[PDB]
Amino acid sequence: GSVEGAAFQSRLPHDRMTSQEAACFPDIISGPQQTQKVFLFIRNRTLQLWLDNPKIQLTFEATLQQLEAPYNSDTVLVHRVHSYLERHGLINFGIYKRIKPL
């Protein structure tokens, strides 16, 4: 990219509706304003809680207990967001597995 003067860890906006995330989630951007809001808010809070250095590995369970809103009450929403994020390739040397010794 022909730009310089800014350098950060993540590669996403601060609370804005971009096509970048929506390209992996066509049903969300073609959905109502509540759906893109909950999906974006979770996905941002997730990647923040991951990069914030929690312990060893951040999980859906560690996300769900940190966030204090009815937004996270849909477990399937969080599990989808996480599953896609890991598979999408956001500099993830690890793979979606348990924390336990296996």
Side-chain angles (χ1 to χ4, degrees):
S2 197
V3 66
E4 62 182 270
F8 293 110
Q9 195 70 258
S10 57
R11 205 63 167 82
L12 287 171
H14 185 85
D15 194 47
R16 301 185 182 184
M17 296 171 261
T18 56
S19 56
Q20 185 182 342
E21 66 90 46
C24 206
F25 314 113
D27 290 272
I28 300 301
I29 190 63
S30 297
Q33 69 190 71
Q34 59 172 48
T35 296
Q36 45 156 220
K37 265 47 132 64
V38 65
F39 211 95
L40 180 152
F41 191 67
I42 290 169
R43 192 171 177 277
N44 286 4
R45 192 82 282 161
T46 293
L47 213 68
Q48 269 62 288
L49 286 168
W50 282 57
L51 84 88
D52 190 60
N53 195 104
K55 38 177 170 72
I56 300 301
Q57 189 186 275
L58 203 299
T59 56
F60 52 88
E61 277 287 281
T63 310
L64 290 163
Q65 71 190 256
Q66 283 279 33
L67 183 51
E68 53 163 83
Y71 279 44
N72 97 94
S73 192
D74 194 327
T75 50
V76 177
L77 208 307
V78 183
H79 290 210
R80 285 171 176 170
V81 173
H82 281 229
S83 183
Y84 276 104
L85 262 173
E86 191 82 300
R87 295 277 72 194
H88 199 347
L90 283 294
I91 319 179
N92 297 313
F93 75 91
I95 307 178
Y96 173 72
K97 283 187 173 178
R98 57 265 154 174
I99 301 157
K100 279 170 172 280
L102 288 176

